[PDB]
Amino acid sequence: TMPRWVPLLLGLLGSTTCGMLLYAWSVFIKPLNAEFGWSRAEIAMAFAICCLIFGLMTFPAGRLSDKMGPRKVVMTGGVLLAIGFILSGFIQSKYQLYITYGVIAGFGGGMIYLPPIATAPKWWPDRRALATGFAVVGLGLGSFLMGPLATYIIEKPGMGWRYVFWYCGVAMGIMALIAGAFLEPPPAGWKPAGYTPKVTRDWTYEEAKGDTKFWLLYLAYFCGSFAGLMVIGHLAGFGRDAGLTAMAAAGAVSSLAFSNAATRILSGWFVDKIGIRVYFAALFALQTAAMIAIFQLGGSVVGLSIVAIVIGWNYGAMFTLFPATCLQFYGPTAQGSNYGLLFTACGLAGFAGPWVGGWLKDTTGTYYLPFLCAAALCALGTAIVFMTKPPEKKHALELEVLFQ
Numbered sequence: 591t592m593p594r595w596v597p598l599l600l601g602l603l604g605s606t607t608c609g610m611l612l613y614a615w616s617v618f619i620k621p622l623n624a625e626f627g628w629s630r631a632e633i634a635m636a637f638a639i640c641c642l643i644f645g646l647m648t649f650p651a652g653r654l655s656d657k658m659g660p661r662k663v664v665m666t667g668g669v670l671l672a673i674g675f676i677l678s679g680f681i682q683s684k685y686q687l688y689i690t691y692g693v694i695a696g697f698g699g700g701m702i703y704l705p706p707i708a709t710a711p712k713w714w715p716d717r718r719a720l721a722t723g724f725a726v727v728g729l730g731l732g733s734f735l736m737g738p739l740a741t742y743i744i745e746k747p748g749m750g751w752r753y754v755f756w757y758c759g760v761a762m763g764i765m766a767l768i769a770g771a772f773l774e775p776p777p778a779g780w781k782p783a784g785y786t787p788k789v790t791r792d793w794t795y796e797e798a799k800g801d802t803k804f805w806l807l808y809l810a811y812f813c814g815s816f817a818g819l820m821v822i823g824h825l826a827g828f829g830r831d832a833g834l835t836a837m838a839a840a841g842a843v844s845s846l847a848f849s850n851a852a853t854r855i856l857s858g859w860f861v862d863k864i865g866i867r868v869y870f871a872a873l874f875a876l877q878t879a880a881m882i883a884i885f886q887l888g889g890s891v892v893g894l895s896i897v898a899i900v901i902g903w904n905y906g907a908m909f910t911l912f913p914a915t916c917l918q919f920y921g922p923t924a925q926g927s928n929y930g931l932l933f934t935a936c937g938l939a940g941f942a943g944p945w946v947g948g949w950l951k952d953t954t955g956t957y958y959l960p961f962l963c964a965a966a967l968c969a970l971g972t973a974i975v976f977m978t979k980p981p982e983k984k985h986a987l988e989l990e991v992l993f994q
């Protein structure tokens with residue numbers, strides 16, 4: 591039937607739509623402050639709500655993708671995202687923005703984000719992590735696509751920022767509907783392959799949800815996610831405090847977007863070839879080291895760039911390697927449910943990480959506390975990821991007894 595790279599393209603399209611949605615808020619920071627008395631933190635509340643709902647809704651999205659297929663889920667998510675984003679276009683108050691952008695749009699976003707992550711590796715049992723990475727790389731590209739577009743619309747005279755919400759929401763709805771229209775697993779039996787009585791079987795959602803290793807991974811995910819989201823917004827400020835100009839610190843920190851994108855594909859290909867656990871643990875350890883190392887390297891464009899690139903590499907890699915690990919532990923059959931539940935950890939980290947980092951800096955007045963806390967979290971994640979080996983593969987005695 592359909593060439594097994596089409597799923598990768600579809601996940602690229604859907605994840606790009608989600609990256610556009612999650613990047614937009616920064617674009618509207620200044621215009622919304624121009625029209626209303628709206629503070630930066632007041633607008634950032636809409637983003638934090640968006641991350642909360644988006645991360646939470648992967649769980650129901652994964653369950654529904656497993657039960658009734660990923661097409662229905664992704665297309666419904668497209669509808670919800672389009673509705674919420676466009677209604678943000680017609681807003682007049684903060685609560686309206688929280689509802690439209692944070693809740694509705696974030697809801698549709700989780701429903702878009704998860705089903706392709708669960709479907710793509712099924713077409714690539716020889717390259718599961720690379721397939722997953724194609725399902726997530728779009729989150730690193732939404733900036734590069736939307737930034738110029740949203741600036742274009744905001745500054746144009748017949749338009750405004752409301753016009754960004756309206757048009758960009760039609761465009762994102764179309765991309766998500768095109769992604770979800772052609773998305774489905776391969777048929778129940780034959781598996782696309784040129785190459786390939788005890789009888790094992792993948793784990794079930796109730797079985798994985800009850801494994802101690804699933805929650806060790808959940809803890810690692812929460813730690814790594816929280817650490818990144820706690821400091822990334824502080825990189826450029828660390829630079830300016832070290833004596834750099836705003837232009838210079840901004841240039842340096844911008845290399846984070848490139849490594850954040852590239853790692854999603856490259857880390858998948860790497861672990862497809864050499865295995866997950868050791869490289870994964872090494873990434874967390876390096877993330878620990880970078881949280882410490884910024885106090886020695888962050889005072890120059892070259893050092894701050896290195897730290898930013900490294901932080902971006904490790905952070906972005908989490909979103910390919912946690913789904914790949916979950917796929918190795920439990921198999922693809924319940925990957926929708928297993929990984930939907932697991933990603934709720936990111937919903938919570940998205941809600942609280944940035945706020946807590948800001949509070950720690952403002953409480954102390956210095957960057958030592960947030961980066962030291964992020965280093966500790968990344969150290970814990972390092973230990974967890976390094977010590978956690980796959981559970982025993984499951985026996986399917988009900989299939990096994992079919993042999994006379």
Ligand SMILES: O=C(O)c1ccc2ccccc2c1
Binds near residue numbers: 641645729936939940
């Ligand atoms: O980088 C990602 O893949 C991603 C997507 C959705 C997310 C939602 C909440 C927090 C972090 C998130 C990260």
